[PDB]
Design a protein around this ligand. Sequence first.
Ligand SMILES: NS(=O)(=O)c1ccc(Nc2nc(OCC3CCCCC3)c3nc[nH]c3n2)cc1
Lengths: 294, 258
Amino acid sequence: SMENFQKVEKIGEGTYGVVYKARNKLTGEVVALKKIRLEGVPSTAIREISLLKELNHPNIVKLLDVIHTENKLYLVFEFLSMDLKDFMDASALTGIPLPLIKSYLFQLLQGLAFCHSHRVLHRDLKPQNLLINTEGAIKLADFGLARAFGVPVRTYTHEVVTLWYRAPEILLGCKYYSTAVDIWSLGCIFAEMVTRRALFPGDSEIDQLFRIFRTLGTPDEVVWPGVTSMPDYKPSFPKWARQDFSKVVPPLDEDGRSLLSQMLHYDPNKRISAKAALAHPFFQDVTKPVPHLR
Amino acid sequence: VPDYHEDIHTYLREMEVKCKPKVGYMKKQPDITNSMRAILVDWLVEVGEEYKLQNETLHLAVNYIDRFLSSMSVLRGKLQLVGTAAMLLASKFEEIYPPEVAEFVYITDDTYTKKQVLRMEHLVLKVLTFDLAAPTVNQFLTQYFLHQQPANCKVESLAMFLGELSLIDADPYLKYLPSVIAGAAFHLALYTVTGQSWPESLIRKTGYTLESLKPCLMDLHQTYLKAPQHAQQSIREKYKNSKYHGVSLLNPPETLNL
Ligand SMILES: NS(=O)(=O)c1ccc(Nc2nc(OCC3CCCCC3)c3nc[nH]c3n2)cc1
């Protein structure tokens, strides 16, 4: 039972379930609680649990326990203070220091690299799914859309990734998609950390493709082999020109720009990977600054 | 070749050892036997053919079954309920569109109720401590396939047939890890169709040689030979289809030479 847990407040709903802030009456430990109502145990919870028990990493949210009672299923998590989106909104007047964007991106990639090294796709990387403590760490959360993939991949659920962060290969309906979809999402978030507005906030699939095309250029066979043969490619697509990356994220380093242009490469194969990304010269001076938050 | 192939292979190799069931669990099962297990596994191949399920789902289900039976005694009349929960859970894990619970109650022919199937799903989950991302023979074969020079669809189908035959007979195949069952399966397939052998590149990747795979390769060679006489025929039937290039109809070689 949850005799030992006192709910403090609700904090959100994501993918499935509901997350409460709660407190361990006996230990004093503040936790997060994901509650599931019980068609059997949801496919989403089955995946989140088994995979998160496998993934133990400082940058991946720790699952502490799994409790029953019925007809409920409680997941018990390490608590964290704030999601990235709220933090970005708190930093509206003052900005987010570059050494902190750097640290955060560095940490995120580590955690993504761990995932991918353990045949795991996140598939829902967005700022509401990234948590931060006061000590300076950022962690990946909400593994509801996650799935264990195989080598090589076969076709998976097409629904995936919330719109603003969805990779072009999903949007254009490629039959296979891989680790490159998590990099894409991470690239958008990188830009968003710098500009504090979402990079491509579309309202429909076509809107999104167009917003991406206006920023990165409408892709052709030269920049992305096989693109004009994709299921949702339309020849009637407006042919926009590519613009300088210096205008896409104006405050950014030459090395920031390099890193970003690689995380947002059209071709999923050409798109840099998390593992490789850690070696990028952007991170040469990387440290671990605290966020200074309340 | 991506940047995670070696990391994933390494991790999968680590994980098969931890996900391994107990080898002599059937000797500890008072009411169930190897033959009864053969019947259950064969039935799940039927179920997977009915609902067009991925082969991965099938291997996962069998892994779950064996791991559950390594710690929980079951009577003969309930083995099929365990089997049904496994298949369900495997579906929820692996499939884009799993079948409803209702559809699972139907294929048991109203032996068990919905409430029974649901409560068993929990029990399995709990007994397996929710750890369901087990490596399978199938997961290794698909990696091994990448080492074909060049690709041959008949080799892949035959490999997966042989690997699927290992699922039926706990004696002997329980004493082998999936990565090894897959090496045997891949070589046997490859030698039958093209007359080629385990590739040196796969030696570099896996550490396995024909000498090291031989014990399993000998056992699998026998299964393949006795397959048309085998009491369970569902897998053979499945692999007559053009989807699998009619590989079950092929003539097995009589000697391997090693
Ligand atoms: N709004 S906010 O910025 O004030 C704030 C944010 C998140 C948290 N804390 C927290 N949240 C989780 O899920 C949050 C959940 C909400 C819905 C979207 C998906 C993620 C967790 N899962 C494990 N640990 C968790 N810790 C505290 C404050």
